């Protein structure tokens, strides 16, 4: 039975940081890239999408282009970790990874944010 | 007796990730900033300088302006976490964390980067 | 504003000397040597570990017995005293000098050194 | 006969520190994994479900994610410990340890947990 | 992957009726009695305890003597069915079959019992 | 007579696994943990050094930093165990455990290290 | 923090002659004799075991029997100081000072043995 | 009712291979060495005569020189393991074990030896 775990269900990241939240999917023998989809969203904004050999920024939502990673060493050993790049207040919600690797599963994450007084008031209107 | 301790003492780094590597050192109840100085450095070039509750920026190299930052919430923890955005081949090095609060103590990280063949082209060549 | 200072930044010995590299910080009054740390290091070999009231040897590495010692009264000065004797040929490199003193600070110290032929056969 | 044993079945743990707390079963010579099935549990919460070589965590209650650990270095010596990290109040109860290993057994262990005021407090809120 | 399954997650039984609640578990062609083990409890009351062949009843608990029954004719069906004689007030509550065949797994199943005034009220005095 | 017993003298363990060799002191109802000292050394370098309530950091040996620890959750029951972590083929020897807890005692136990031929060439050349 | 410590990590003393090899712990006030534990070894074999005031001569090995003292006098100093009397070439090899007093710490001492031929010649058959 | 039990009556062996015959007696929560003694042969031949504290060989066969040794760690576990290094065809023929811990019994083991042409031709000539 194809599972994706996540080690933590929830981050709490700083404000300007960066951040890389993780889901697991079964690798037993060699990766076969080709049968691989990681699909990262976060409420209904697409952050990355890898079908086949490389990312689709075809997609991808406007706030995350030149932030958002998928490490790409990490799927051999079944780790899906998305990397998001100087992390904001509307980065602050639930994130969805999908993976298709044989079976085909997700899972969900929620990322808090911390942000300081002056972060929060330029956010807040 | 004041130690520094490393979770890792080696990261392996895939090129253009982020990355954060660690140095704990021991806090007791509530973390008194006014003590605490916090240093980072690779191979004599100073990264993070932390003193009193802010970064010091007047001896930063040029390789980390605006790349580096010092997890501040962690040092509650006793977690002097240092985030490099963006790694380059450059990047790969000897780490070390100086960190003086009460005792002093230091600490030393190897950090690898694997690359793609045209990301290590551009380095070769330049 | 904390800050170590060295008088020399390059430091030229013959072999079979006796060598004092120096790093000096700013006491004022009374030097409350309970809040003092020394470390002398040279290419993650340390040197000196003066921790408290006095050395402590447990970290020293196998190149630096009995031939490397901080000289401590110095400290009343702000001397933060490393003098290697019978200098050999791998003391040549980069020293470090680790100072604590309310604030903290360290200096780097370049250390080449020059011989004859009949000690060089290593 | 197939009998687990439990050297404490009452452990006092502080607040925010480490338990480890074993259910001894009976190893002939060198252990078989294959035949070895290790549950534990805690209040109808599965904790540890360990069978062939490695755990399950699919099954893991989320409140014992990334704090719950059993020992497999001394699986070999009959012992099966489990570790929680930075117990908290909720930890409080009656353990279970059902092992499996040719015959089948299984034991309860009480942990009553210590707590300051504040942590309490922290506690009693949720 | 062994796995014990329950048709009935909840019984509804009435005062003084029987009860007949059952775990199955997989069994294919020849039943191995050297190598089964069940396990029937009830909030740490242990009700039968059959190992290797037949119960041990020096285990069992009091209130469960001469009332309680495995049906070894059963066993070969892949069925753990534990039956109640006479079910009392204090028969309801969440009970445990622990199954060790080949590999060993448990599950759970809740009773609720319904009585009249009278023996309620005798099982609240 | 204080007495550390050993259950096992001998370990063979695999390169690359964990390891966790337990020794035994007698510890009636509660610890006494500003009494207790705990060496671990094998072959004249230190690995553990636990003195009053916390491991001392600077005893120990290079080669065994970021690979062993003493598990204080088991001094409790009576047991300095300590574990080594991604078992080298260096760590073969005959380590010792000093125990002061009242009386003193120390014993000795022998650990192998199996290991296939990349590790072994590895070990012999480096 | 109770520390021992040795004025010489490393004799050469002669064939034949006497040796004394010192272990310094330090002693405040008078000494407590009570919550003293000495215990010289060399090479897994017991030489002194001072316990409660006296020497435990049981386990002692019999190679040292006769031949093995710890000056008493010392100890009040702060001093252990166990003495062998006629080196044999097989007294040469590390020696273990153990020493409990309210603490507890150890240390190592190297003992080398000068020879003549003759004494060697029939070490060595 | 004491009783020796045998997990193997019969062992067919190798020459010069080694060998452990077993012999399990019920030692109940922890053993008394004061009150054991065990007794091992081979056709009347004493091999190991474990009285008290351990083996005294006065009556030692010259032929069990070296060879024969009581494995005491498994007598705590109700184990009178006999090890025979260096198999020889001598060897072969019924061992006894003979053990009184309150009661007392002894049971018999077969012990076959094969061997290839030269150890058993040096054995039919000798
Ligand atoms: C030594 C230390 C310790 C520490 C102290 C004792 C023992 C072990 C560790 C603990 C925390 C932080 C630091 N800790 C500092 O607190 C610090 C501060 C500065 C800035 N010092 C200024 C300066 O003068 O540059 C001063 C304000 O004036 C450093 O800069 C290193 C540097 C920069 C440029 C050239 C050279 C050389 N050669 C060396 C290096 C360091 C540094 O490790
Ligand atoms: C664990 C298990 C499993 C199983 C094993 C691993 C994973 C999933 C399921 C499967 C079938 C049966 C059992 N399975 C048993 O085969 C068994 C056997 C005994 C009897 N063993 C005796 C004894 O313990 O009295 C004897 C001393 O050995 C039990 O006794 C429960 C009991 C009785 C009294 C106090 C306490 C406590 N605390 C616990 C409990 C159990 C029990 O679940
Ligand atoms: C450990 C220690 C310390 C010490 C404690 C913690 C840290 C640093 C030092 C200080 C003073 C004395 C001792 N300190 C002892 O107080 C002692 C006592 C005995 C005798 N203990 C009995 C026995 O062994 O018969 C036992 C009660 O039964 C020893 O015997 C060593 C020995 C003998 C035979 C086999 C093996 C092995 N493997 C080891 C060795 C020692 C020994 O260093
Ligand atoms: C071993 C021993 C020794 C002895 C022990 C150690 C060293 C040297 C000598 C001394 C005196 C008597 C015995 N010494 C026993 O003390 C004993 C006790 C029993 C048990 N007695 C039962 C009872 O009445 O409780 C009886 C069954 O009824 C035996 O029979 C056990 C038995 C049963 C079935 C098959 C075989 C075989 N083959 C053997 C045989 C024996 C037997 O030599």
Chains 1, 5, 7 share one sequence.
């Not at 993780?22 to 049968?35: N, R, T």
């Not at 998305?82 to 997700?106: E, F, H, P």
Request: proline letters at 2%; charged letters at 25%; aromatic letters at 10%.
């Amino acid at each position: 039975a194809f599972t994706v775990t996540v080690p933590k269900d929830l981050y709490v990241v700083e404000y300007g940081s960066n951040m890389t939240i993780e889901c697991k999917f079964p690798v037993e023998k060699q990766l076969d890239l080709a049968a691989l989809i990681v699909y990262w969203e976060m409420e209904d904004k697409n952050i990355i999408q890898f079908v086949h050999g490389e990312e689709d920024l075809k997609v991808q939502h406007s706030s995350y282009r030149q932030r958002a990673r998928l490490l790409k060493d990490q799927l051999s050993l079944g780790n899906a970790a998305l990397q998001i790049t100087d992390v904001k207040l509307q980065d602050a919600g639930v994130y969805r990874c999908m993976i298709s690797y044989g079976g085909a599963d997700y899972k969900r994450i929620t990322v808090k944010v911390n942000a300081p007084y002056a972060a929060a008031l330029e956010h807040h209107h």
